[PDB]
Ligand binder design. Structure first.
Ligand code: HEM
Ligand code: HEM
Ligand SMILES: Cc1cc(N)nc(CCc2cncc(CCc3cc(C)nc(N)c3)c2)c1
Ligand SMILES: Cc1cc(N)nc(CCc2cncc(CCc3cc(C)nc(N)c3)c2)c1
Ligand SMILES: C[C@H](O)[C@H](O)[C@H]1CNc2nc(N)[nH]c(=O)c2N1
Ligand SMILES: C[C@H](O)[C@H](O)[C@H]1CNc2nc(N)[nH]c(=O)c2N1
Ligand SMILES: [Cl-]
Ligand SMILES: [Cl-]
Lengths: 362, 362
């Protein structure tokens, strides 16, 4: 039953992948080899080209990603050879280091062994390799509320945070065979952080805001040709809105708009003053300014939308059918100022692709 | 064939309408009367209660409307008795006058005779009873580009605009039997306009911006129980974003962001400065300020979203299933600051409702 699914997804992937690579003739043989490998081993193994390209195709088919223009420049690290929790840990450390690149962020994915019989070889508990801890107890909210579950789950296993608003969560993952996951404290020399300051408002530094430079997603499954790489952390650079309009602005997150309104010298009393809208912009101006001033890669939503437009154009020219999720593609600040707002997108799911998978804890 | 459709939509509407009104017992008889009326006349006629309520239900089911909270306070004018183009003209004049109410805008709908055999008795060419003319010739763009087709169609019939950026388009509609539509110049004493000024920036008045106070939609069909009221102009007040983030901001409209950026003293050179986002807010602050300062009703998107939330709550409490269009419900400025952004809506179409119908010209 399962070997039928795997076989059909393999035929589809190889025939398409080799067509884009220009190896349409090599399809016939590679198919037969796969047919035997699935017949005997129950699962086939990707070549380095198939894996590297399949990961690039997956990014290209991420309907909710606005930065898909550079899908073909994805730096792919093949760590399907790891067996010990030290190799995995070091691989995670390396990914952070190489992807950060002193600030010149490289879109990188590290690929660990896939699910064998649906059985995870590696199980990463982090949603992002670099994230801030969250604490909620006695009506006291500290840090990132979105990380409350993982933080508590980490603290159930002997980890303890300093209870600042920006405690670096440890790398926590579980091996196949192990009943409990292990956790490792993040070497702070590997983590670039950016303090948020305003280009013309010196009082903005009184807010003492900051964020990590590199978003490394580690809660999604890379699916390539029937093979399920559940542990494949990937990263790009930030679109400024993600930090200033969601992470630091949301009431369910850092909730900083009232404090931002105070330091910029506007009242936060009346809706018709649009103080939230005004605070949102200045905060986002501060974020972009701070990242550029530090030398950490970042993109504004207007530039990102322009890049995504070229991606649309590039897609049509290559004969590729375009897919996208309008609700996620539009930026949370001035969405009507982008071309994305004024056109529709097909939200059909095309494989290879990245799929969200629920965490073992909460 | 048709009389089957009309009969089923009549059963559904009357049984539901009379249930909400508390006249569930009167359903049985009224149904039978309708059954005979459709049998003989080919179409039935609504009572004043059924029409008034059906129009309120239609507003309540407008998935793309954020201001549905006050659906039950809709002022319904029943002008199904008009026969001459003077009665229709005066009815249109009256609607404008009563709905404006010196600035205290009343949500009002004027209902003209429905399509008889699918044949329109009245055919309104305006998209809004009050709108600005648009001119495009010799690379010269004047007025509202969205109104270019109608403006040219009006000028084909002897009308001529002064070619300012805010020429009031004439009321233009066609009668059943007439081959051509008639046009009437709008009595300017009936039209409230609001000059746009900034609360703290005196240089904003140098832009010489303004907009009409009342949006009166006249391009949609009111469908109530199988009956098609193609000509039923309705109005509410403005949500500030509609004027400042779409009408005056869009490149395909008035395209004022660069000029707004200049008068507020910011550079319009770099994307990372977020000058578009910053200009958008200040322009929208100016719009809300100008309407409140003049005494013309208006709502900000934050207040509107709060009102729409009560509508959601009211819906659940009444046992009513909620329907909405997320893509239209979110405001084009700071959408993530509203609850609407963080929840989903069923975009199912429930009747009675308002349906868009293409204009006879372009
Ligand atoms: C080059 C820098 C990149 C930028 C600026 C970017 C931008 C974004 C943004 C803004 C989102 C939506 C976040 C939200 O508002 O919720 C997103 C989603 C996503 N991006 Fe990208 N992205 C980048 C690189 C990548 C890379 C390298 C991959 C993987 C190969 C990727 C795959 C995805 C996926 C899978 C999602 C959806 C995640 C989910 O389910 O929520 N992106 N991207
Ligand atoms: C009370 C004041 C009202 C406000 C503030 C309001 C607000 C809005 C807004 C913002 C939109 C979307 C416009 C856009 O962004 O494209 C909308 C759409 C709509 N509203 Fe309302 N509305 C109001 C009253 C009414 C009334 C009185 C009716 C009719 C009974 C109505 C029916 C609709 C319909 C049918 C649409 C969709 C029109 C289309 O197809 O584009 N609304 N409303
Ligand atoms: C590679 C990459 C780059 C970038 N700039 N942003 C992202 C998205 C980051 C991101 C941040 N916060 C939240 C999410 C979504 C979380 C999420 C949660 C659930 C339940 N289902 C989903 N499909 C997704 C994504 C990814
Ligand atoms: C009663 C009412 C109040 C209000 N504040 N806004 C509206 C919507 C006004 C409005 C302005 N510009 C454009 C539109 C949509 C035009 C439109 C165009 C097409 C092709 N299909 C549609 N369904 C709709 C609506 C209606
Ligand atoms: C494709 C997209 O859903 C469509 O163009 C919607 C987007 N949201 C919108 N929002 C508003 N206010 N008005 C519109 O016409 C639209 N159009
Ligand atoms: C219901 C709604 O479509 C859903 O919550 C979407 C809206 N758009 C979004 N946009 C972003 N950036 N992130 C999200 O998680 C969502 N969620
Ligand atoms: Cl993030
Ligand atoms: Cl309008």
């Amino acid at each position: 039953e399962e070997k039928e699914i795997l076989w059909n997804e393999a035929k589809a992937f190889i025939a398409a992948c080799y067509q884009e690579l220009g190896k349409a003739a090599e399809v016939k043989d590679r198919l037969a080899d796969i047919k035997s490998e699935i017949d005997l081993t129950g699962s086939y193994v990707h070549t380095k080209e198939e894996l590297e390209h399949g990961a690039k195709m997956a990014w290209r088919n991420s309907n909710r990603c606005i930065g898909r223009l550079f899908w073909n420049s994805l730096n792919v690290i093949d760590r399907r050879d790891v067996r010990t929790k030290e190799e995995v840990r070091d691989a995670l450390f390396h990914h952070i280091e190489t992807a950060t690149n002193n600030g010149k962020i490289r879109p990188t994915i590290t690929i660990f062994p896939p699910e064998e019989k649906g059985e995870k070889q590696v199980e990463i508990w982090n949603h992002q390799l670099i994230r801030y801890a969250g604490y909620e107890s006695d009506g006291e909210r500290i840090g990132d509320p979105a990380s409350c579950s993982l933080t508590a789950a980490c603290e159930e296993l002997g980890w303890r945070g300093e209870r600042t608003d920006f405690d670096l969560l440890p790398l926590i993952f579980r091996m196949k065979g192990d009943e409990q996951p292990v956790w490792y404290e993040l070497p702070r020399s590997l983590v670039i952080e950016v303090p948020i300051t305003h280009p013309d408002i010196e009082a903005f530094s009184d807010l003492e805001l900051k964020w990590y430079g590199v978003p490394i997603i580690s809660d999604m499954k890379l699916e390539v040709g029937g093979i399920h790489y559940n542990a494949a952390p990937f990263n790009g650079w930030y679109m400024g809105t993600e930090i200033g309009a969601r992470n630091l602005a949301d009431e369910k997150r850092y909730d900083k708009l009232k404090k931002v309104a105070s330091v910029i010298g506007i009242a936060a009393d009346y809706n018709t003053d649009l103080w939230k809208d005004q605070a949102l912009v200045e905060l986002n101006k501060a974020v972009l300014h701070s990242y550029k001033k530090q030398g950490v890669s970042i993109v504004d939503h207007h530039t990102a939308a322009s890049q995504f437009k070229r991606f649309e154009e590039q897609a049509e020219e290559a004969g590729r059918k375009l897919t996208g999720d309008w609700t996620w593609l539009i930026p949370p600040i001035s969405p009507a100022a982008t071309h994305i707002f004024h056109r529709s997108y097909d939200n059909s799911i095309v494989k290879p692709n990245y799929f969200y998978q629920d965490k073992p804890y909460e």
